[PDB]
Each structure stands twice: as C-alpha cells, then as structure tokens.
Amino acid sequence: NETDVMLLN
Amino acid sequence: SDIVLTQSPATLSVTPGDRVSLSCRASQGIYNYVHWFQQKSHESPRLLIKYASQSISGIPSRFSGSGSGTDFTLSINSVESEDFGMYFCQQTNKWPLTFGAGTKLELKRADAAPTVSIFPPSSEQLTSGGASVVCFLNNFYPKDINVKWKIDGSERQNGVLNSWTDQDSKDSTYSMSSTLTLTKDEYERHNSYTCEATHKTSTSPIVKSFNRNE
Amino acid sequence: EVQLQQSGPELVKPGASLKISCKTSGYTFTDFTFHWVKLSHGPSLEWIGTIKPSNGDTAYNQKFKGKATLSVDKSASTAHIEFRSLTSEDSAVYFCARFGGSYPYAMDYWGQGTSVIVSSAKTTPPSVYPLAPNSMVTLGCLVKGYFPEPVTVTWNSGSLSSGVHTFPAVLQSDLYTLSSSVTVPSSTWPSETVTCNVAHPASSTKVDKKIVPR
C-alpha cells in the first residue's frame, strides 16, 4: 500500500 | 523488483457475440490494485474496470473484472464490433506503476496464405540514382509473418523497410509491405531479387522473384 | 465535462529539450495526481511518473530519471513534462491522465496524446514511384523521401476503394517511406486506368501517378 499516501490521500 | 504483469495469450481471436476472458498475472501479490484499459490505434487508453472488479460510469455492463492477489481477469459478456483493439492491465499497488504488455482482441477468421507480389524499381527512381524493390504480402491470417530478402541467393538485411497494417476492417486479414532500397549502381551488380514469405499456412515459404536482366 | 487537453504534435531535433503541456478544464486541477504515459510501437504503454498538483510531490519510473521532469503551473491549471537530450528512442505518443473520479481513484480522464518525432529532417516533398508487375493483379505506389507525416493516398480519386492497403509510414535515416497497394481483376488492367493520388499537406504537394505496364 506504499502508493496510497500519494494517490488516494 | 518492478511488478511484472503478464497478459497471456497476447492475442485472442473471437467472433462478435462470443464470451471472452483476458488474463493478467502479477509477479507478486498486489491485492485488488489492478485496473483495465481499452486502447485503439494511437487513441487514449480508456478505463474499463478499477480495483479488479469496480465498475466505471458510462462503461457498458458487458465488461466485468474479477480476481485478486496475482490472478486477474477481464471478461466481455458478448463481444460487440466496437470492442476489437488492445486491452492493457495496470497495477498501482507499488512504485513504479506498471502495465502488462497487452492482449490484442482480434476478429477470428480462416487462415489465409499471403498473396505475394514483387516489383522491380521504376524507371523514374532509377533515373534519380535509386533502386527500391517492393514486395507486398497481402491479406494473410493470422498476423505473424516473416519476410527474407535474397539477392543472387544471399540473404540481405541492409536497406530493408517493413510496414504492417492493422487488421482489415472488411475481411479481418493482415498485410505487410517490404521495401529493399539499393543505389542504382548496387542494383545493377546483381540479377536475382527474391522475397520469401514464411507464414503458418505452409511448411514452405512463398518465394517471389524476378531477374533484372529479363 | 472534465477535459485534459494536450499541446500539439512536435517535430524536434536530436539533443533538444522539449516541454509538453496538459491543460485541464471542467474540474479543480489540484484535486488529483497527474500521470504521464509513453505509447510506443507494439503497441506498448509505459508509466513515466506522477506529480501531486496540490504540493509538488512526485514519483518517477527510474527508467525516465533525468530524461523526464514533471511540473505543474497552478496559475493556469496546466501540467507539464519536460524532456532533455532527445533521441529517436524518445519518438512516441505521450499521454497525460488524472487519477481521480469516484473514490478509490483511478486513471479516469486522459489527454488526447501528443506525438513527438525526434529527427534532423526538414520539410521535404515525397517522390511517388509506380509499382507495376493471375486472376487478380496487384499494383501500387511507393512514396519515399518525405518529411514530416502525414501523407494520404487514394486510388482514382477515391473511386477505387476496395482491395486497397495503405501501409503506415516508417521513418528510416530521417526520411519517411509509405506504400499503397490496390488489387483489381487482371481483365481490367491496363484497359481501366489505375492512378494513385498522393497528398502531402506539409509541402503543399498533391500528385498523381498513373500505373502503366512495364
């Protein structure tokens, strides 16, 4: 889940 | 390591109305973080399904997705004429974001050997000091094909320009053009110009040739 | 309606730097991350990187580190990608996409694509050569030595539309070659004339080539 910070939040 | 998405088979041949399933396999577990796109010619990719199974507003109900972990599937419940083109999967679970190599959804038809035609250089080009020899390998199916040029019985790879058409909208075949360009001086040092087409339709290549001095 | 509008096709020289734009309308630009994608022969899709317009955070595909730099101009709701030291390997169609829509987001809206051709070529009109040699006969036209794309081809001013294959142009040694074939019953040629009409708008060229027996 390393991409959530950038893509979803 | 970058996540590798494998889409296999690379080509699916169907007829409108068929039910089809397209596979996208991940090199490591990516939970539900797979999205599917349709892509035609050089047009923009079009999002069909997100997060393996989630529907997109405006996308026809015939498209659905399923799978998780490393095994994903895009399904078309009755293929329509507008659906032929490329399908790419994409993962967004890890950096860098990656795509699969795509599956081509093509129209199925009967196998057909290429119609091969060879052409010597025109006198107009010869006057300008150039010599192009053209071979058309037309209306064949399936798409994979190989062309080899032989000059005086020797394979020549220098000066060869190949181009391939997309699947023909009328008869579902593929075509290829191969041009071998020499100077007029080099063209006159040889006699036999041959293009050999290898295709799944025969164990023997189709051999088209001409002799310059004839 | 959400729209991502990209800048026009680019014809640039080797070693140059180029900036291409992705201008949005119909929504708040800073809501979602922008992504850049390279469409190359295959077709093949590659992800270059993403920028978060709200704060300038980025993530890049290491393959494009140095080559491509992402930025945003919040004052004009425009995303940019800048390429440095351009080579023929960078000739491709580049797409921008936002990563938005309903939660959880995905690449839902895309630009129309920007074609980038890296070449030392200047505008050059095509040379149009005839391709002259069964129950059917194939004839053609060989369109060589031109720049840039596009060249369009018709047969008998569009009257001969069946049995035509016009091949995608291919750039080789900084000039393009295109070819087109037409198949007619052998009984109709040379009695019924066959002429290709070749248009090259960039050089204000529109020429006809009648195909006559050798």
Q: Nearest CA to CA, how far is A6 from chain B (Å)?
A: 11
- Cβ within 8 Å, pair A2-B92: no
Resolution for this experimental structure (Å): 1.7
Which of C62, C110, C181 is the best mutation test for B, with the most CBs of B within 10 A? C181
Looking from the CA of B202 toward its CB, the CA atoms found within 13 Å total 13
Distance CA B8, CA B141 (A): 20
CA distances from C177 to B113, B157, B205, C139 (A): 25, 17, 26, 17
- Cβ within 8 Å, pair B92-A3: yes
Cα nearest neighbour of C42 on chain B: B101
Cα nearest neighbour of C92 on chain B: B42
Q: Nearest CA to CA, how far is C16 from chain B (Å)?
A: 24
Phi/psi for C27 (5° steps) reads -155, 175
- Cβ within 8 Å, pair A8-C50: no
CB-based contacts of C179: which residues, under 8 Å, 6+ apart? B134, B136, B163, B177, B179, C131, C140, C141, C142, C143, C166, C167
SS3 call for B141: strand
Q: Is C103 on the interface with A (CB under 8 A)?
A: yes
Q: Which of C65, C100, C120 is the last residue of a domain?
A: C120
Report which of B30, B177, B152 is spatially closest to residue B98, judged by C-alpha positions: B30
Q: Which of C88, C120, C152 is the last residue of a domain?
A: C120
Say whether both C173 and C204 belong to one domain. yes
Contacts of A6 in chain C (CB under 8 A): 33, 50, 52, 57, 59
Q: How was this structure determined?
A: X-ray
Instruction: Give counts: helices (H), strands (E), chain A.
Output: 1, 0
Q: Are C194 and C156 in contact (CB under 8 A)?
A: yes
Say whether both C50 and C91 belong to one domain. yes
Say whether both C164 and C128 belong to one domain. yes
Say whether both C108 and C44 belong to one domain. yes
CA distances from C201 to B150, C74, C148, C169, C205 (A): 37, 37, 9, 15, 6
Quickly count: other Cβ atoms within 10 Å of residue B171's Cβ: 12
Check: CATH 3.40.50.2000 for B110-212? no
- Cβ within 8 Å, pair A6-C104: no
Q: What residue numbers bound the domain in which C160 lies?
A: 121-214
Contacts of C33 in chain A (CB under 8 A): 6-7
The whole-angstrom distance between residue C109's C-alpha and the CA centroid of its chain comes to 20
Say whether both C108 and C172 belong to one domain. no
Distance CA B34, CA B98 (A): 10
Distance CA C108, CA B44 (A): 11
Report which of B136, B141, B135 is spatially closest to residue B113, judged by C-alpha positions: B141
3-state secondary structure chain C: CCEEEECCCEEECCCCCEEEEEEEECCCHHHCCEEEEEEECCCEEEEEEEECCCCCCEEECHHHCCCEEEEEEHHHCEEEEEECCCCHHHCEEEEEEEEECCCCCEEEEECCCEEEEECCCCCECCEEEEECCCCEEEEEEEEEEEECCCCEEEEHHHCCCCCEEECCCEEECCEEEEEEEEEEEHHHCCCCCCEEEEEEHHHCEEEEEECCCC
Q: What are the extents of the domains in chain B? A: 1-109, 110-212
CB-based contacts of B171: which residues, under 8 Å, 6+ apart? B109, B139
- Cβ within 8 Å, pair B97-A3: yes
SS3 call for A4: helix
Distance CA B81, CA C99 (A): 29
Please determine whether the domains at B1-109 and B110-212 fall in the same fold group of CATH.
Answer: yes
Distance CA C186, CA C163 (A): 13
Say whether both C112 and C192 belong to one domain. no
Say whether both C136 and C49 belong to one domain. no
Those chains having 3 or more beta-carbon pairs within 8 angstroms of chain C are A, B
Say whether both C139 and C208 belong to one domain. yes
Q: Which of C81, C96, C120 is the last residue of a domain?
A: C120
Q: Nearest CA to CA, how far is C138 from chain B (Å)?
A: 7
DSSP state, residue B186: H
Check: CATH 1.20.1600.10 for B1-109? no
Say whether both C102 and C150 belong to one domain. no
- Number of domains observed in the structure of chain C: 2
Say whether both C100 and C184 belong to one domain. no
Say whether both C77 and C127 belong to one domain. no
Which of C33, C47, C102 is the best mutation test for A, with the most CBs of A within 10 A? C33
